[PDB]
Amino acid sequence: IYENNAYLRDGKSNLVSKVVELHGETYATTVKMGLSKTPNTATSAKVKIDAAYLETYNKAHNTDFALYPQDLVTFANEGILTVNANTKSAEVEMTIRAGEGLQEDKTYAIPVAISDQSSDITIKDEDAKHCIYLVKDMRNAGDAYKGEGVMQGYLFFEVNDVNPLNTLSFQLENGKLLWDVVVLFAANINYDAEAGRPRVQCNPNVQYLLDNNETLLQPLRRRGVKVLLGLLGNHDITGLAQLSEQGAKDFAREVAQYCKAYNLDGVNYDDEYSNSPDLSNPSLTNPSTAAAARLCYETKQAMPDKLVTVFDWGQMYGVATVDGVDAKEWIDIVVANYGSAAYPIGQMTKKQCSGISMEFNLGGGGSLSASKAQSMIDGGYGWFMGFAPSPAKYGSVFSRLQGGGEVLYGSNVAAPTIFYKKNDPTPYKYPDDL
Secondary structure, eight states: OOOEEEEEEETTTOOSEEEEEESSSEEEEEEEEEESSOOOTTOOOEEEEOHHHHHHHHHHHTOOOEEOOGGGEEEGGGGBOEEEGGGTEEEEEEEEEOOSSOOTTOOEEEEEEEESOOTTEEOOSHHHHEEEEEEEEOTTOOTTOOOTTOOEEEEEEETTTSOGGGGGGOBBTTSOBSOSEEEEEEEEEEEETTTTEEEEEOOHHHHHHHHTHHHHTHHHHHTTOEEEEEEEOOSSSOOTTOBOHHHHHHHHHHHHHHHHHTTOOEEEEEOOSOOOOOTTSTTBOOOOHHHHHHHHHHHHHHOTTSEEEEESOTTSSOOOEETTEEGGGTOOEEEOOTTOOOOOOTTOOGGGBEEEEEETTTOTTOOOOHHHHHHHHHHTOOEEEEEOOOGGGHHHHHHTTTTHHHHHHSSOBOOOOEEOOTTOOOOEETTTTO
């Protein structure tokens, strides 16, 4: 009864690891110490930046984040945590100021530690002792940023056929880009017989985009769009919901390597098209939501600064804890089947969920109308999803985007004037050049 365990997390998000995107000169939050038992009148603690922990953290995650300039990070009240006995917690305000001279497209780290805690508090390990902020300066990349807390767009391109530069065809009347996140659908998981293990396998269209990311993908990222690699099953014994713990660790490492090598922003996992596993292979296991959750968790551990997202399909979603860590920490966005809204699990919120999914090629899932936009706002949803737009179908696609933008952003989606052909960086005139 006397063991009062403490741990640290970001107070606004309740995450122990929080990615912060700076769109202005300051970002304000709290650091919160949570307690497992009611404190007494003498309970006390402070927080401090723990620069030495960054080496330990980078080693644990095989990352290379630089330390955010400590002069830009300030705590109220000398970092002393104000204890709230009634809520088993203690908090202090922290402000992150945007700085000059720090390198573009680079994630910096603020490791924060509990310090000088009273002896009635137990800190089990170095994980509980710390939380971490992963900071990216986005001040120049605001075209996709439509405001703090607005609903955001999540778009899949079938890159076998359609150039993802067509993201730029979708703007509000004020020029803001509609689609905050785009997915290159899809690289595959497949069995490598010579290696006896699953691997990422890219068809020539996916591979061409990755090889040419500087001309066909990075222009999107310059304007604030997050570009994710889609992963999908592909008709062999391997699958995203049937890797063993070891297989998931190995596959997560490969996914993170792809996102680093090609300067991408994360992954979408879609459990479809796999066949039954060979249960004799140590990299595989019985297909299950538990195996899918393991892969998501291990992927987040390998790229904590990047998005781990799932299509709620097959066995990809539903288990809410891995190794004692809640899904809030390792599912950033979940999108659901056409005609449904996604739902949160664990301690996730609806801000991590799609409120609509629109199949732009086949027609299902409804429209982002004014009424639907307001319904999703009322429900607290964070995302609207679209799948497989193409210039040849822009008439239908944009008809399904009428009205919603005024509700979500105060600016309706504009008629398209530009489109891109497959593998071609040239902006063509829509519709004249079709």
